Design a protein around this motif. Structure first.
Motif, mmCIF file in Angstrom:
data_model
loop_
_atom_site.group_PDB
_atom_site.id
_atom_site.type_symbol
_atom_site.label_atom_id
_atom_site.label_comp_id
_atom_site.label_asym_id
_atom_site.label_seq_id
_atom_site.Cartn_x
_atom_site.Cartn_y
_atom_site.Cartn_z
ATOM 1 N N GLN A 222 53.141 53.832 14.589
ATOM 2 C CA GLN A 222 54.268 53.705 15.504
ATOM 3 C C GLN A 222 55.602 53.875 14.793
ATOM 4 O O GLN A 222 56.578 54.300 15.419
ATOM 5 C CB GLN A 222 54.225 52.350 16.210
ATOM 6 N N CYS B 39 51.226 45.108 16.738
ATOM 7 C CA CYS B 39 52.619 45.156 16.345
ATOM 8 C C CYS B 39 53.514 45.094 17.579
ATOM 9 O O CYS B 39 53.036 45.165 18.713
ATOM 10 C CB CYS B 39 52.886 46.420 15.532
ATOM 11 N N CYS C 81 52.820 48.161 19.870
ATOM 12 C CA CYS C 81 51.466 48.269 20.399
ATOM 13 C C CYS C 81 51.085 47.090 21.283
ATOM 14 O O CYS C 81 50.187 47.228 22.118
ATOM 15 C CB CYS C 81 50.465 48.393 19.251
ATOM 16 N N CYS D 250 53.277 49.179 13.028
ATOM 17 C CA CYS D 250 52.284 49.891 12.242
ATOM 18 C C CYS D 250 52.838 51.232 11.772
ATOM 19 O O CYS D 250 53.824 51.749 12.300
ATOM 20 C CB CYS D 250 51.006 50.100 13.051
ATOM 21 N N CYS E 57 47.456 49.921 15.151
ATOM 22 C CA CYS E 57 46.958 48.767 15.884
ATOM 23 C C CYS E 57 45.976 49.143 16.985
ATOM 24 O O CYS E 57 45.263 48.266 17.482
ATOM 25 C CB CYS E 57 48.123 47.988 16.504
HETATM 26 ZN ZN LIG Z 1 51.116 49.111 16.192
#
Ligand SMILES: [Zn+2]
Ligand SMILES: [K+]
Ligand SMILES: [K+]
Ligand SMILES: [K+]
Ligand SMILES: [Mg+2]
Ligand SMILES: [Mg+2]
Ligand SMILES: [Mg+2]
Ligand SMILES: [Mg+2]
Ligand SMILES: [Mg+2]
Ligand SMILES: [Mg+2]
Ligand SMILES: [Mg+2]
Ligand SMILES: [Mg+2]
Lengths: 16, 132, 77, 343, 103, 36, 225
Positions: free
Chosen positions: E94, E53, E56, E91, E42
Motif C-alpha cells: 500500500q 495496516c 487495508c 504495508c 496485509c
Molecule cells: Zn496493508
RNA sequence: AUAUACCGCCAUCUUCAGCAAACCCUGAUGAAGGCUACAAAGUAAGCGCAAGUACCCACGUAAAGACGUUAGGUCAAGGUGUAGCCC
C-alpha cells in the motif's frame, strides 16, 4: 487491567 | 484470639448492623436475645424442642424471603402462639410480601400445630450501626 | 379561582408545584404528556400571585410546546 | 441433612479461601482461581422445577378481572423455560466475557505509558478534566519488618499534564497498586510546572544538564521532526505539549532522576523575550527556508542598546564530541536514524 | 467511483474524526526497535492478516490520485516528504500505491 | 417505566395527642415504629 | 452592567496611585532610628542574603541601613494596606514569646488574625483536613519574627510560599529573606522596634478598612441619585 | 488425600499497647523519615487498650484483649475447594 475491568428514581403511592 | 461471632476490623468500608457489631460477651449487656421462650428457665421443660424449632424457622424464613431479610429474626412465644418478627427490605412488590406471609403463616401453623403469625417491618435499606 | 391573602396564596403555590410535578412524572409518560389548558393556566397564575415569577415565566414555553391557548387572565397578570 | 446446610456467604468464604496463610503473604499463587458467583442473580421467587404457577408470586394475581388459580406448566412448556434460563446464563457469561481491552504501554507487560485518566475532582468542586495522567514506573518495594518479615509495597511514578505547558509528576506509595495510582496522580496536579515552548511545539534552545548521574541533552527541532527521545521523555512531552524535540539520555537511566531532571531542565529554559529583555537587543531568527529574510522574534520592552554585541572572533563554548562527530560524518551507528513509528 | 466522498461522509468522521487514518495504528513486533520494513502485504489471496495496516483495515479507503485528502495524510505538511512505511504502518504494497498516487 | 413504590408517611403523624391509645395497641403486638 | 463599574471605581482605582493610603506619613528614618530598628545581630550571626540590606558593622555589631528599610517598609505597608482594602485575611505570625501578648492584641484591635503559638504541622498545607473543605486561608501573612525559637526559619515561611500566599516579614541580620515576598530589614528583638512595627501595620490596616467603607458609601449614595 | 486451599472454633506472645485508612511535610520527589511543651511537621476516622458492664464496692476477680507472629491446632464437630473410590 489490559484485558478489561467490567464488574458491571421517581416514586409513587399505589404505583402501576 | 477469640473468633466466635466477631466481625473483624477491616478498612472502614464494611457496614455492620447493631447485632453484628456486638460479640457474645455483650449478650444481656448491650444486646438482647433473638428468641424469647420459657424453655431455658429454671424448672422448665422442652428446651431441646424449642431450640430445633428456632433453628428451622430461621432457615425457613431465609429461603422463603430470599434477599428480603434486613436483619436477624426475632422469635416470640406466648402460650402456644408463635410470633415471627422480621425486618425486611422494600424491593419485593407488596403483593409478593402478602403471598409469602399468607403462605408462610399457614404452612408453619400446620407444621408445628400452633397459631403462627408473621409481622413484617420494612426498611428502605439495611440499617448500619457502624463501618468496620 | 379567586385571589386570596398572601399566606393562603403561598400555600396554594406549594401545592400547585407538587401537582405540576405529578403532571411531569406521570406513568403515562411513555405516551405524550397531556397537559390540559386549564391546568397550565391555573398553575401559572398561582405562581404569579405567590410571587414566584421566575417559575411562571419558565412555564410560558409549555404553552407553545403543547399548543395550549393562554388564558386572558394569565396574560394580564 | 437440612440442619447441616449453610448460607451462600459462608460457603463462598470457605471455598474462595481469601483469608488464610496462603492469602496473608501471597504464599499461594492463583493461575487458576475460584471466582465468586451470585447464584440468586437470575433466580425468580416462585419458580421451581415442577413448573407450578403460583398466583401473586410468579404469575399475575388477576387475569381478565378474575383471580387466577393454581396451575402447572406442561412438560413441554417447562423444558422451554429451563432451556431459556440456561441460554440466559451463557448470555450473561458472554456479556461478562465481552470486556473492552485497554491499550498496552511501552510493552505488553509494562505499566509505563498507560493512561490513568484525569485526576479526581477536588473537594471544593475542583475538576481536572483537561489533564491527562501517564504512568512512568511501577515498582514493587520489599520492606523487611521486625515481626512480619518481608512485606510488599508499591511505589508508582506518574506524570500529569494538560498539553499546554502545564505538567507535573509525583510519586505514590501504598500497599495496593491502585491506591498508589490515586495518590501519585492526585498529588502531581498540585506540583505542576509551567514549561515554555517555542511556537508551542518545541523548546526554546538546546538543553544539556546532569541530574545526579543521569545526563539529558535536548535539542530544539523544527516542525515535523517529531519526538525522537527516550520513551519516558516522549510520554512526558505529550503531556507538556512538545511536538518536535531530540533528546539523548546518558549515564544512569533512572526513571526518577530522568523525570525530575527533565522537568528541572525544561523549567530553566530562557525564552526569546527574556533574552531580549536581558540584553536589550533584538532577537532575529534566520531560517534557511525563508532565505536571508530577518525575522524579529523578540524585541526588548525597555530601551534598545546602541552598542553592538561584541563579536568574539572565537567563542569559548564547550562542545559535545557526539554532536561534532556526527556533523563531521565520523559518527557510525547501526541504531541511529532508524525508521520508527510516528511519535 | 468517487473515493473522495468517503472522507466527507459521517461514517468517516465518526471513525477517524480529524486525525489521520493511521493515527491509532500500532505495529506488533518484538523488541523496542521495530523491523525496518513493514509487512509486504496485509491482503494475501483475498485473506486479511490479523492486524491489517491503516489502509487495508478499512476497505472504503481508496488510494487514488484524485482522493487528495487521503494522500495528504501520508505527506508531511511542513516538509512535503512522503512518510516512510514504518512511520504510518502501511504495508509495503500500500505504501507503493500511495507513493505512486501522490506523484 | 413504572414508578417505584413509595412508603406512606408513618400514621403517627396523623395521631392526635388526645387520642384513645388503647385502640391503637389493643392486644400484645410487636413494637411498630410507624404506629408508636 | 453594574459590576464592571463597581470593580473599576473601587477595586481598580486604588491601584492607579503610587501611595493611595499615604503610608509614607506613618514613619520616617528618624522615627525608625529612635526605635532602634538599625540595630542588628553580631557579625558572626550574619546571614549572607541579608548583606545587601546592612549598612555596616559597628564593633562587630551589624547596622541595618535605614534608608533601605524605609523603602522596603513603604512597599510592605503599601501592600498590606491594599490587601486590607480588598478585605483580605491578614495573619500575623511570630514565635517570640516576649511579644505574643502584644501581637495578639494588635491583631484583635485591627480586626485581623494572629498565630503566635506553636505552629502545628500542616496548618497551611493541610488546612482543609484540619479546618474543613470550605476553610478560607489567609490572603496575606505578616511575620514580625521570621525565625522560630531554635533559630531556624519559621515553618510558615516555606508553607506560605507553597500555598501561594504573599508574606510580609521583618528580617533581622540573621534571617533569610529569600522567600519573603515583601521583606523589611529591621530589628526584631528590641521592644521599641517591635512596638513600632505593630503600630504601623495596625494603623495601615485600620486606615485601609476605613477607606474601603468611605468609597463604598460614596459609590452607593451617588448610585441612587 | 490435602489444616501447605478453607470457613468455623481456638492456642501463642497477651502477666502486651499498639494497628492504621485518608491526607500533609522532610530527604534534590532515593530506599526511607516525620519528636522536643520556654515545643523544631505532623493531623488522623476506625480497631484495641481505656471506659463501661458481671460478681460482694470505686477494690479484686472474671470478661475483654486489636493488628500481627508460629503456612501453630483441628478436613475425625459440622460444612467445604481441589484430587481420588463408586461390586
Ligand atoms: Zn496493508
Ligand atoms: K486456621
Ligand atoms: K472438616
Ligand atoms: K475436604
Ligand atoms: Mg483465651
Ligand atoms: Mg505480550
Ligand atoms: Mg533579631
Ligand atoms: Mg495452619
Ligand atoms: Mg474495676
Ligand atoms: Mg481471662
Ligand atoms: Mg477492657
Ligand atoms: Mg502446619
Amino acid at each position: 487491567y489490559l484485558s478489561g475491568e467490567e464488574v458491571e428514581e421517581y416514586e409513587c403511592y399505589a404505583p402501576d | 484470639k477469640n473468633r466466635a461471632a466477631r466481625v473483624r476490623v477491616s478498612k472502614g468500608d464494611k457496614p455492620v448492623t447493631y447485632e453484628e457489631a456486638h460479640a457474645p460477651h455483650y449478650i444481656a449487656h448491650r444486646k438482647g436475645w433473638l428468641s424469647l421462650h420459657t424453655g431455658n428457665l429454671d424448672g422448665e421443660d422442652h428446651a431441646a424442642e424449642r431450640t430445633v424449632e428456632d433453628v428451622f424457622l430461621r432457615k425457613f424464613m431465609w429461603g422463603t424471603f430470599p434477599g428480603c431479610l434486613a436483619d436477624q429474626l426475632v422469635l416470640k412465644r406466648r402460650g402456644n402462639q408463635l410470633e415471627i418478627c422480621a425486618v425486611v427490605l422494600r424491593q419485593l412488590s407488596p403483593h409478593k410480601y402478602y403471598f409469602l406471609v399468607g403462605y408462610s403463616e399457614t404452612l408453619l401453623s400446620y407444621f408445628y400445630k400452633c397459631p403462627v403469625r408473621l409481622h413484617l417491618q420494612t426498611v428502605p435499606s439495611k440499617v448500619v450501626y457502624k463501618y468496620l | 379561582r379567586d385571589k386570596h391573602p398572601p399566606e393562603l396564596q403561598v400555600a396554594f403555590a406549594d401545592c400547585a408545584a407538587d401537582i405540576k410535578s405529578a403532571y411531569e412524572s406521570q406513568p403515562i409518560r411513555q405516551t405524550a404528556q397531556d397537559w390540559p389548558a386549564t391546568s397550565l393556566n391555573c398553575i401559572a397564575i398561582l405562581f404569579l400571585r405567590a410571587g414566584r415569577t421566575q417559575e411562571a415565566w419558565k412555564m410560558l414555553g409549555l404553552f407553545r410546546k403543547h399548543n395550549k391557548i393562554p388564558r386572558s387572565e394569565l396574560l394580564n397578570e | 441433612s437440612f440442619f447441616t446446610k449453610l448460607t451462600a456467604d459462608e460457603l463462598w468464604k470457605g471455598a474462595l479461601a481469601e483469608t488464610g496463610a496462603g492469602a496473608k503473604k501471597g504464599r499461594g499463587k492463583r493461575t487458576k482461581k475460584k471466582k465468586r458467583k451470585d447464584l440468586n442473580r437470575g433466580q425468580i421467587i416462585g419458580e421451581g422445577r415442577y413448573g407450578f404457577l403460583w398466583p401473586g408470586l410468579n404469575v399475575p394475581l388477576m387475569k381478565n378481572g378474575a383471580v387466577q388459580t393454581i396451575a402447572q406448566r406442561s412438560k413441554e412448556e417447562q423444558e422451554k423455560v429451563e432451556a431459556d434460563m440456561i441460554q440466559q446464563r451463557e448470555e450473561w457469561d458472554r456479556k461478562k466475557k465481552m470486556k473492552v481491552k485497554r491499550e498496552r504501554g511501552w510493552s505488553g507487560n509494562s505499566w509505563g505509558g498507560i493512561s490513568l485518566g484525569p485526576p479526581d475532582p477536588g473537594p471544593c468542586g475542583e475538576t481536572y478534566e483537561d489533564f491527562d495522567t501517564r504512568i512512568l514506573e511501577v515498582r514493587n518495594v520489599f520492606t523487611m519488618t521486625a515481626k512480619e518479615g518481608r512485606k510488599k509495597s508499591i511505589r508508582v511514578l506518574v506524570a500529569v499534564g494538560n498539553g499546554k505547558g502545564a505538567a507535573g509528576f509525583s510519586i505514590g506509595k501504598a500497599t495496593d497498586r491502585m491506591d498508589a495510582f490515586r495518590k501519585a496522580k492526585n498529588r502531581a496536579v498540585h506540583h505542576l510546572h509551567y514549561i515554555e515552548r517555542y511556537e508551542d511545539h518545541t523548546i526554546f534552545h538546546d538543553i544539556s544538564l546532569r541530574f545526579k548521574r543521569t545526563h539529558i541533552k535536548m535539542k530544539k527541532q523544527p516542525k515535523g521532526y517529531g519526538l525522537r527521545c527516550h520513551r519516558a521523555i516522549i510520554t512526558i512531552c505529550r503531556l507538556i505539549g512538545i511536538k518536535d524535540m531530540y533528546a539523548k539520555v546518558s549515564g544512569s537511566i533512572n526513571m526518577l532522576s530522568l523525570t525530575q531532571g527533565l522537568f528541572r531542565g525544561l523549567s530553566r529554559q530562557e525564552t526569546h523575550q527574556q533574552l531580549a529583555d536581558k540584553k536589550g537587543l533584538h532577537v532575529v531568527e534566520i531560517r534557511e527556508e525563508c532565505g536571508p529574510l530577518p525575522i524579529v522574534v523578540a524585541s526588548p520592552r525597555g530601551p534598545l542598546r546602541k552598542d553592538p554585541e561584541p563579536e568574539d572572533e572565537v567563542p569559548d563554548v564547550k562542545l559535545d564530541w557526539e554532536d561534532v562527530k556526527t556533523a563531521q560524518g565520523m559518527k557510525r551507528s547501526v541504531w541511529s536514524n532508524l525508521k520508527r513509528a510516528a511519535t | 467511483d468517487e473515493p473522495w466522498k468517503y472522507l466527507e461522509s459521517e461514517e468517516y468522521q465518526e471513525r477517524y474524526g480529524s486525525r489521520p487514518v493511521w493515527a491509532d495504528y500500532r505495529r506488533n513486533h518484538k523488541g523496542g526497535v521495530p523491523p525496518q520494513r513493514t509487512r509486504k502485504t496485509c491482503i494475501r489471496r483475498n485473506k486479511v492478516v490479523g492486524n491489517p495496516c491503516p489502509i487495508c483495515r478499512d476497505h472504503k479507503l481508496h488510494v487514488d490520485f484524485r482522493n487528495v485528502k487521503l494522500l495528504e495524510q501520508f505527506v508531511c505538511a511542513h516538509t512535503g516528504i512522503i512518510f516512510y512505511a514504518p512511520y504510518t504502518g502501511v504495508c509495503v504494497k500500500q505504501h507503493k500505491r500511495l507513493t505512486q498516487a501522490i506523484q | 417505566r413504572p414508578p417505584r413504590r413509595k412508603a406512606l408517611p408513618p400514621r403517627t403523624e396523623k395521631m392526635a395527642v388526645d387520642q384513645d391509645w388503647p385502640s391503637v395497641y389493643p392486644v400484645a403486638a410487636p413494637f411498630k415504629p410507624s404506629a408508636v | 452592567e453594574d459590576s464592571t463599574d463597581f470593580n473599576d471605581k473601587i477595586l481598580n482605582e486604588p491601584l492607579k496611585h503610587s501611595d493611595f493610603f499615604n503610608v509614607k506619613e506613618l514613619f520616617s528614618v528618624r522615627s525608625l532610628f529612635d526605635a532602634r530598628v538599625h540595630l542588628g545581630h553580631k557579625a558572626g550571626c550574619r546571614h549572607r542574603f541579608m548583606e545587601p540590606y546592612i549598612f555596616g558593622s559597628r564593633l562587630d555589631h551589624d547596622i541595618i541601613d535605614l534608608e533601605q528599610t524605609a523603602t522596603h517598609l513603604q512597599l510592605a505597608l503599601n501592600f498590606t494596606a491594599h490587601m486590607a482594602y480588598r478585605k483580605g485575611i491578614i495573619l500575623f505570625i511570630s514565635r517570640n514569646r516576649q511579644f505574643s501578648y502584644l501581637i495578639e492584641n494588635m491583631a484583635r484591635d485591627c480586626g485581623e488574625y494572629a498565630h503566635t503559638r506553636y505552629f502545628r504541622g500542616g496548618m497551611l498545607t493541610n488546612a482543609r483536613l484540619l479546618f474543613g473543605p470550605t476553610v478560607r486561608l489567609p490572603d496575606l501573612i505578616i511575620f514580625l519574627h521570621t525565625l522560630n525559637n531554635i533559630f531556624e526559619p519559621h515553618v510558615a515561611v516555606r508553607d506560605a510560599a507553597k500555598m501561594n500566599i504573599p508574606t510580609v516579614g521583618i528580617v533581622d541580620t540573621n534571617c533569610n529573606p529569600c522567600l519573603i515576598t515583601y521583606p523589611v530589614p529591621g530589628n526584631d528583638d528590641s521592644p521599641l522596634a517591635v512596638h513600632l512595627y505593630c503600630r504601623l501595620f495596625q494603623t495601615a490596616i485600620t486606615r485601609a478598612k476605613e477607606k474601603r467603607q468611605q468609597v463604598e458609601a460614596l459609590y452607593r449614595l451617588q448610585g441612587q441619585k
